Design a protein around this ligand. Structure first.
Ligand SMILES: Nc1ncnc2c1ncn2[C@@H]1O[C@H](COP(=O)(O)OP(=O)(O)OP(O)(O)=S)[C@@H](O)[C@H]1O
Ligand SMILES: [Mn+2]
Ligand SMILES: [Mn+2]
Lengths: 290, 229, 301
């Protein structure tokens, strides 16, 4: 294809950490939307696959991730959102992950995080970055419009539930999630909001989130949801982890964070989760690029 | 010549808790080990090189992999087979892709140094062993190896010992392995004879263009076009 | 007078206008700008007056310092922040009103319940093990309330910033280090600092029309070490060079840009605009503000 050559050089160009032009970015997002529209709210994913968490614009650390777990399309990846904001390279980071999706839609899944919205990208840097790197708001338009299309959750081999945030008191089953309309700005409240905002915590039952959006859920809720939906594990991100990954709720839930040494301050490791040919999990911890 | 070298200072730097001094002392080994001679590096330096082959930090492991071809060159083929073959194979199975990738390039440099007949004897089997690994990341390494090794192994070893494995892996449960068969066949093809190509390679690629997976189809079709079949 | 417990009032993004047009906002911003004006051109070692109310606010902060000593970090596995922070915070929750009542005279004792809320909101989030500029704002709001009830007076304006707010920063820095607290709402390479904002404003005010120190001098290690005892801005830089990795230009991008600003004057000027733009007009920060009788949500009157 004439357009595969084009895509291939874009990927090559982006791996050198060089941004695409406004015109190119526009085409990329248009063709990404076509692909993403066909994707379900609970997007079906087949193991083997590697599950990743927050990148927050740390492009060189994303390259380190591919050094650890293998490059696309050889290695199958699954990203649970928060690609943009805070780092120097939200543009390059998100452009590549989108590029790869259009090129190998069966080799990657990119999920929507809470940072993948119009409201939050204007708070934590993505808007600023686009303006400074392109001279106008158009690239921010093409991306934030595209974010509306990202699937909310994923399901690997029907057994491992993946999403950015956590569970919702409004959602008992995976069918409730399929029923939802995701093709909008992340709402201020409700089931869609909770899936991208919620956290697990150490006290029982539901709890209104200190974040001001979403809920915090206890081990009994995790145990009920998993059992009720035939799930063995909820894989999620949305929180800083010193060790890269964090078990909780008696191994019903795992938190994966992929931005090492967060804010040049935290000195945390980053992690990714490899899922076997036979759905067995293992973790790879890594520090930043030298 | 080097019997007054402060080797104790070097060993402290190789075993150092600080990573940067580990990496910097490895950069010396190339020149130092030559001047120190086969016997002294074997008795006084090699137990520390072996430790570092499995260092906790992957970038230290990587530097040893890069030093490996020089160390094997100095130490000769016969000693490599008894103490150093295992190190090189254990790297192909490393959790970190970068280490897997570099152990592959390493096999190539060693083959250029020791020759293709030695490769048949001591390398090819161990590489093919991985094709039955439960993990797709490891099974793919076999193909990455075959890609790199077919060049320096010549038509015959490629045809007899490497090719049948590639063709077998065309029936893998995992698509990633399947499209990497298509990519391998594109790479190793020009080395084989047209009879082998028309009779054994062409039917497999055509079957691979009928594959459920989009990427297997594409790369299979691309191999057919490139090899003009 | 007539006091109530402060409650949240900004619940939605459309509620952000209500905030902008409120009495609380007018007072708060007017309070920051006042303190800013009082410390213009002055060193930390400047000779000013210290009242009984000030010396008792420092004691308050020393009590909080003492509690960190008496509540060391536990050797338990945790996500990021150390769980010993929750034990510490629970002490501030139980004892806040008593600590405030040692600062507020007995005739104004009815104001203690309202005022103490702001202090409880000024030391980070117990659940998240967080600290952000929103907590820092709550402490300014706390201090603002003490002025409105007359406990602190006009003459205390320099003491408030140089003694009380300055000691406050030491205690927060300690908290952030000791319990391994994470940044609440850091803007990363686009924000001023992950944890603080206000000391950069008041700090730059001191350096307005300085004979030899210009904004370019704070990215110079030697200038900072030789002068941080006198300037709040430089102290903040010292903590950043102590707590962050890499070259300055990498970790603190926005501050690296600021060093290229011609005068401390324009730095103070710009930081005021930026504070309104990036903190006081950002919903995820303001949603947690609390309004009572002293700092109310009703339109400015
Ligand atoms: N400047 C601030 N000061 C204090 N609290 C804040 C500030 N900004 C936001 N918050 C609140 O503190 C919470 C934690 O902030 P962060 O974790 O840094 O950002 P977040 O968007 O909640 O998390 P991410 O980045 O999606 S993983 C937010 O949910 C807000 O409720
Ligand atoms: Mn995040
Ligand atoms: Mn998030």
């Amino acid at each position: 294809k004439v357009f595969t050559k084009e895509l291939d050089q874009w990927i090559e160009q982006l791996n050198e950490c060089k941004q695409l032009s406004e015109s190119q970015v526009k085409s990329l997002c248009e063709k990404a939307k076509e692909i993403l529209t066909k994707e379900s709210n609970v997007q079906e994913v087949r193991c083997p696959v590697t599950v990743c968490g927050d990148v927050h614009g740390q492009f060189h650390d994303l390259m380190e991730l591919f050094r650890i777990g293998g490059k696309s399309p050889d290695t199958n990846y699954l990203f649970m959102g928060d690609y943009v904001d805070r780092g120097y390279y939200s543009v390059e980071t998100v452009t590549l992950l989108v590029a790869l999706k259009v090129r190998y839609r069966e080799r990657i899944t990119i999920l929507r995080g809470n940072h993948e919205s119009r409201q939050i990208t204007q708070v934590y840097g993505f808007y600023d970055e686009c303006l400074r790197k392109y001279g106008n708001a158009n690239v921010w338009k093409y991306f934030t419009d595209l974010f509306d299309y990202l699937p909310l959750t994923a399901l690997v081999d029907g057994q491992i539930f993946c999403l950015h945030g956590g569970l919702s008191p409004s959602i008992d089953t995976l069918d409730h999630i399929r029923a939802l309309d995701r093709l909008q700005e992340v709402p201020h409240e409700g089931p869609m909001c909770d899936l991208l905002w919620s956290d697990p915590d150490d006290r029982g039952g539901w709890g209104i989130s200190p974040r001001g959006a979403g809920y915090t859920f206890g081990q009994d809720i995790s145990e009920t949801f998993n059992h009720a939906n035939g799930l063995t594990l909820v894989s999620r991100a949305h929180q800083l982890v010193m060790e890269g990954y964090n078990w909780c709720h008696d191994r019903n839930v795992v938190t994966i964070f992929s931005a090492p040494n967060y804010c040049y301050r935290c000195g945390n490791q980053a992690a990714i989760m490899e899922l076997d040919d036979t759905l067995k999990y293992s973790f790879l911890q890594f520090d930043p690029a030298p | 010549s080097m019997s007054l070298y402060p080797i104790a200072v070097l060993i402290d730097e190789l075993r150092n808790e600080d990573v940067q001094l580990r990496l910097n002392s490895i950069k010396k080994l190339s020149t130092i080990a030559l001047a120190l001679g086969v016997e002294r590096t074997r008795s006084e330096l090699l137990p520390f090189i072996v430790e570092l082959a499995e260092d906790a930090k992957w970038r230290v492991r990587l530097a040893i992999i890069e030093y490996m071809p020089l160390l094997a060159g100095q130490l000769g083929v016969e000693y490599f087979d008894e103490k150093l073959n295992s190190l090189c194979m254990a790297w192909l199975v490393d959790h970190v892709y970068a280490i897997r990738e570099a152990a592959t390039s390493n096999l190539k440099k060693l083959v250029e140094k020791f020759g293709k007949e030695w490769a048949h004897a001591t390398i090819i089997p161990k590489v093919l062993a991985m094709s039955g690994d439960p993990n797709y990341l490891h099974r793919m390494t076999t193909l990455f190896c075959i890609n790199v090794l077919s060049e320096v192994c010549g038509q015959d070893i490629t045809t007899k010992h490497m090719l049948p494995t590639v063709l077998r892996m065309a029936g893998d449960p995992v698509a990633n392995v399947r499209f990497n068969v298509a990519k391998s066949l594109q790479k190793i093809g020009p080395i084989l004879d047209n009879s082998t190509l028309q009779s054994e390679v062409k039917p497999i690629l055509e079957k691979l263009t009928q594959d459920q997976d989009v990427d297997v189809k594409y790369f299979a079709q691309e191999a057919l076009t490139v090899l003009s079949l | 007078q007539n006091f109530i417990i402060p409650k949240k009032e900004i619940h939605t993004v459309p509620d952000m206008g209500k905030w902008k047009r409120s009495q609380a906002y007018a007072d708060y911003i007017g309070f920051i700008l006042t303190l800013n004006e009082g410390v213009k051109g002055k060193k930390l070692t400047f000779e000013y007056r210290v009242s009984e109310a000030i010396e008792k606010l420092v004691a308050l902060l020393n009590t909080l310092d003492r509690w960190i000593d008496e509540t060391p970090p536990v050797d338990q596995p945790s996500r990021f922040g150390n769980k010993a922070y929750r034990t510490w915070y629970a002490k501030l929750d139980e004892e806040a009103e008593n600590l405030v009542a040692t600062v507020v005279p007995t005739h104004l004792a009815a104001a203690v319940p309202e005022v103490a809320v702001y202090l409880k909101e000024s030391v980070g989030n117990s659940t998240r093990i967080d600290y952000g500029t929103g907590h820092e704002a709550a402490f300014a709001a706390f201090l603002c309330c003490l002025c409105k009830i007359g406990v602190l007076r006009v003459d205390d304006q320099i003491a408030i910033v140089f003694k009380v707010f300055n000691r406050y920063l030491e205690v927060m820095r300690k908290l952030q280090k000791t319990y391994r607290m994470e940044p609440a709402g850091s803007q990363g390479v686009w924000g001023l600092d992950d944890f603080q904002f206000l000391p950069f404003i008041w700090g730059s005010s001191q350096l307005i029309d300085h004979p030899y120190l210009e904004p370019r001098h704070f990215v110079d290690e030697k200038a900072v070490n030789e002068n941080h005892k006198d300037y709040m801005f430089l102290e903040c830089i010292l903590f950043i060079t102590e707590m962050k990795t890499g070259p300055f230009a990498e970790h603190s991008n926005q501050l690296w840009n600021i060093s290229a600003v011609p005068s401390w004057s324009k730095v103070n000027q710009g930081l005021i605009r930026m504070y309104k733009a990036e903190c006081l007009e950002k919903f995820p920060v303001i949603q947690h503000f609390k309004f009572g009788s002293l700092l109310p949500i009703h339109p400015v009157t």
